Design a protein around this ligand. Structure first.
Ligand SMILES: [Cu+2]
Ligand SMILES: [Cu+2]
Ligand SMILES: [Cu+2]
Ligand SMILES: [Cu+2]
Lengths: 657, 648
């Protein structure tokens, strides 16, 4: 009905009162729905903003459950899901929206609440409720860049957008270029990774992943998704694999983990963001900041560094022991199947953790510690730095150090699992004899990258700015389109089903030697995974880069999955050598019997109960090598193939077409 | 298309070869589709009936997966979904039919298989496939009475139907009366409940319920229906409530549970059925038969009584402990919300059970033990008695004892739940001031029952019988139509939505006083549950007996739902006193944002099944008349039976 489309208007101009009129509509709000500030002059307002509106949306007056807790958070305050207290506020609000009887009342509750609670919080609480209600499915949720550009753009632009919108008439407005490589100069070698850390795409993917797989609320409210623990492990694990790749393409070494929390943090980061909702800027972190015990009375944080250290010591113990202990005292075994999934819920701390009290909230609390080095006891009345918000956490270099450490802990479990036997990863009959890649106007086995400007309308997000269009020009990494061509022989006499699993890693190390397996296995980034039917004899399989199951299209992100333009590492101008790897596994073993919708539920989707692959995530390379194996070229079975690829960057700006 | 209608022809005459022609059609069965018995004389056969057919259905020759497993079960053997081995065979066949994507290849696979596999098995496997594919939806499957009358009718009639059909010309054929109250004489007081145990209607309802909610099925999608565990609890729980009602109307006490499996079973039952597919009869059970350890090597059953006892001991422990343990070792808590649902899947064992290995297959294995007392080690090469088949299980009195026990186990959990507070079952503003019932030509607050003959065409099920019509006359309980009239006051100033929940129980005890709540709560049978919009002030709600959400129409059964004619207990000639109860709950709380429209999504009521009375009374409450809140009402009803046979 219309109602579905009317809720989307709430996302429009988050700080402009709801009675000011969104898009080509306006809400006809009761007087008891007006805020205390504006209610005493309600007559003057409803009339004043009624003009220029095609439609007028009525709203029925209900009682509405108590909004005390939702309103506890200040309006000009920041909102993070990492902070213990905010979690309890969101879960209260989400409960109101995710218990609202009708689509009429959801709209009524929302319209009332919207101008009383924190915009950032409202956006989150609504998102999730709509996302997981059974009568608001298939809904096109606005990009959070468009509603909250302050979390994605240098603060400098805002006063230019205000100038341009006020001075120049619509239609004649110049697109505002968004600064890139702006957080640090060349004295800081970390500045080279701007195109990854600060890319709009990857920050949106991270934010959205945490939307659809929260770690707190209610198991029916989306917490208990199949293998979400393993997902948490793998997704974040691939972030660092991809990051480490991009590091090698900028003449840097692999990211160093956060060994121990008492030693200083070498790499500072000033993010250059200004929260228009908080009306303040995010604090920076200086070079050689030290983690400090937190005592944030307001936020309900009383945590010592030793608490964190204690959790880590215990988690390590469990991993080595090989089992964990639940609240009850019983033992649960970290086996080949569910071990990783359990560990994930323990480490991030999802209510699915079999003993939160013992093994703690290790990952999340780390994000808070790192974000509050500048003001840990609240004596300076300052908010958290960028690592305290999922929306912005990936911008800071320390993210990759903290997430690198966490990964080492997971690894400590994976190296205990028994090596995959020759048998286990052989496909009797199937043999892959070669894989190549071809781009239009480029040699075989060669990928190209470059810069590309794209445009985004940030109009809906610019509160109290003259109406009209406000286009912003993003510069971001892009790759030339390509396609894989895989030669597979059947030699069976029957149609064979198979999973095509495509990863890509560096060929050599930082010192220029052909990488060993033990090293290289951890640097393999997944590039594609798809089902294929093989006829007897010979089969030529072709797969386009844009069909990737790791990626989501341009149009989806701007106008949940990994951004398409970030699919290929940057490489070097002189060319960066890389091993492309493909494996065909026996789909009959890997199959997950299931009924599936597969239509852009941002990647097909996988919002259906189960995850569509019985094998472990990162399956060929998640475990150690079997005896005798030493490098990729002798790890291989017949049903696998390796290919030398060369990744060439070109420092030029192509248009978006 | 036609294809949908052509599959329905497979259900016609299950034991007549598929090339003999069904209805006004015939299949053009290839010569390599003829069975090894019939292939060598294909020429003479194909053109025996070759002219006399209006339509001729072609059938394309396809690959056809290996049908070894489906064909493992003998053709002259009995089926049963309780037997472990049959489950694996059926689930595999279901998988084949289900796995042919095209609706034309399904017809081809079916036509081939039909004459190679066990008819009972075929019928099940097809029924399940059709009901749960997308292309074959809303397809009206023929009543299993019409295709397999042997499971529903005294064997005596069959030789009369054969005589009548051979001797007398069509049009002059007399309807065959089906014997009633034929399994036992008046020396057995259990014989009085024939009209319930042996009623066609209720046996069909039971069979069909297990069709749409299986407990084992390749793909955990069709087994995983919303609250199927709680459904399993409640549905079966209502069977016994209704049975116990009918017992009181025949001067009997409440059904005694199977306290322990070592003690003899007092009540024997000879069902008098003859399987025309097995060409044998179902075995009877003698008086004072004892359960015995099973070793049915063929059927793949190796179970000791102590195994059953061990499962029970463990389930009781879990229920008292208040939690279960999954395969992984984790604990899951039997809370107010999902507790009952979990327990249901545990008891009887649905693949949804969080730990089958520990808590076992308790309900199902019980059905097998009870059905094999006469031959537990297969030394006598005899098949299972009536309790071994869902289609026939309700005929035996022991069914209600075994299902009575099982219910007590569920109860043990329900009595742990906290009593519903005055608050929880009050509807602020709403007040029900009275409920009555009226039948045409009968005093107020009075229900009538009687016997009624109905007719069913068993023609499609009578294999190798001269074609024509074969009408059978069933005698079954019936009630005079009636309607409820409910007086509800709003006193709010706004339109209030509400759920009307109507139950009926016996009024008094054996000593002649008002029954106490603790007792009476378990004897309340659901009569209706429907949504109503109330205007401010006063509202007069009227509801017909035939609008009941517990029931399905006549036409569906004869031509899943409780039979309409069985909606009202029998009562006595002198009149049987009963308390009619109604409650209006706040639909806003009970609502679930998504017999009762299309079934395939959710159970439309957030409240527990049997909601007013599933839990113990709050402090101070003692009998129904002080359990009541304003938004409830009680009414004395009198149920009168009349021993006469009315026409339709
Ligand atoms: Cu994250
Ligand atoms: Cu993180
Ligand atoms: Cu049953
Ligand atoms: Cu049963």
């Amino acid at each position: 009905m219309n109602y579905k489309k009317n809720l989307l208007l709430l996302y429009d101009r988050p700080r402009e009162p709801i009675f000011m009129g969104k898009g080509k509509s306006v809400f006809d709000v009761p007087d008891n729905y007006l805020t205390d500030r504006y209610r005493p002059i309600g007559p003057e307002i409803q009339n004043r903003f009624g003009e220029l509106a095609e439609e007028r949306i009525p709203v029925r007056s209900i009682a509405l459950p108590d909004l005390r807790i939702p309103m506890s958070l200040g309006r000009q305050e920041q909102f993070s899901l990492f902070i213990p207290r905010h979690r309890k506020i969101a879960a209260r609000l989400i409960d109101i929206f995710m218990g609202m009887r009708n689509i009429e009342e959801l709209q009524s509750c929302a319209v009332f609440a919207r101008d009383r609670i924190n915009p950032y919080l409202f956006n989150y609480a609504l998102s999730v409720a709509l996302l997981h209600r059974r009568d608001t499915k298939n809904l096109d949720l606005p990009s959070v860049v468009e509603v909250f550009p302050d979390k994605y753009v240098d603060s400098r632009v805002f006063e230019q957008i205000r100038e341009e919108a006020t001075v120049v008439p619509e239609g004649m407005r110049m697109p505002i270029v968004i600064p890139k490589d702006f957080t640090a100069s060349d004295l800081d070698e970390e500045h080279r990774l701007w195109y990854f850390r600060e890319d709009i795409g990857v920050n949106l993917h991270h934010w959205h992943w945490h939307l659809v797989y929260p770690f707190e609320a209610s198991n029916r409210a989306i917490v208990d998704k199949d293998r979400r623990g393993e997902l948490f492990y793998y997704m974040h694990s691939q972030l660092i694999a991809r990051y480490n790749f991009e590091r090698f393409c900028n003449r840097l070494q692999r990211v160093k983990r956060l060994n121990n929390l008492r030693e200083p943090i070498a790499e500072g980061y000033f993010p250059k963001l200004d929260s228009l909702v908080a009306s303040r800027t995010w604090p920076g972190r200086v070079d050689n900041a030290v983690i400090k015990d937190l005592n944030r009375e307001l936020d309900q944080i009383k945590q010592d560094v030793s608490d964190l250290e204690r959790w880590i010591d215990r988690i390590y113990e469990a991993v080595h022991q090989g089992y964990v202990v639940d609240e009850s005292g019983n033992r649960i075994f970290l086996d080949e199947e569910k071990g990783i999934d359990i560990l994930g819920n323990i480490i991030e701390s999802s209510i699915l953790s079999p003993n939160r009290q013992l093994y703690g909230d290790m990952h999340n609390v780390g994000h808070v510690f790192l974000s509050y080095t500048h003001d840990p006891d609240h004596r300076h009345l300052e908010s958290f730095g960028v690592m305290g918000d999922v929306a912005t956490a990936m911008r800071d270099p320390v993210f990759y150090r903290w997430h690198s450490f966490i990964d080492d802990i997971f690894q400590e479990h994976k190296i205990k699992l028994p090596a995959y036997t020759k048998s286990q990863l052989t496909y009797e009959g199937i043999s892959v004899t070669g894989i190549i890649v071809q781009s239009e106007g480029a040699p075989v086995n060669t990928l190209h990258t470059y810069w590309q400007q794209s445009d985004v309308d940030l109009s809906r997000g610019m509160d109290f700015v003259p109406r009209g269009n406000v286009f912003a020009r993003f510069t971001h990494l892009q790759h030339a389109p390509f396609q894989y061509v895989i030669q597979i022989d059947n030699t069976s006499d029957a149609q064979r089903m198979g999973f095509v699993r495509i990863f890509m890693a560096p060929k050599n190390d930082e010192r220029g030697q052909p990488m060993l397996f033990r090293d290289q296995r951890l640097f393999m980034v997944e590039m594609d995974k798809f089902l294929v039917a093989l006829r007897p004899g010979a089969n030529r399989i072709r797969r386009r880069s844009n069909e990737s199951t790791v990626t989501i299209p341009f149009e989806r992100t701007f106008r949940c999955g990994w951004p398409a333009h970030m699919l290929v590492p940057k490489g070097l101008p002189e060319g960066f050598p890389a091993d492309l790897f493909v494996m065909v596994s026996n789909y009959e073993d890997d199959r997950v019997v299931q009924d599936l919708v597969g239509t852009c539920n941002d990647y097909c989707g996988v919002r259906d109960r189960l995850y569509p692959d019985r094998k472990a995530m990162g399956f060929p390379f998640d475990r150690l090598a079997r005896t005798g194996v030493d490098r990729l070229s002798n790890f291989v079975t017949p049903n696998m193939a390796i290919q030398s690829v060369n990744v060439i960057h070109i420092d030029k700006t192509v248009p978006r077409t």
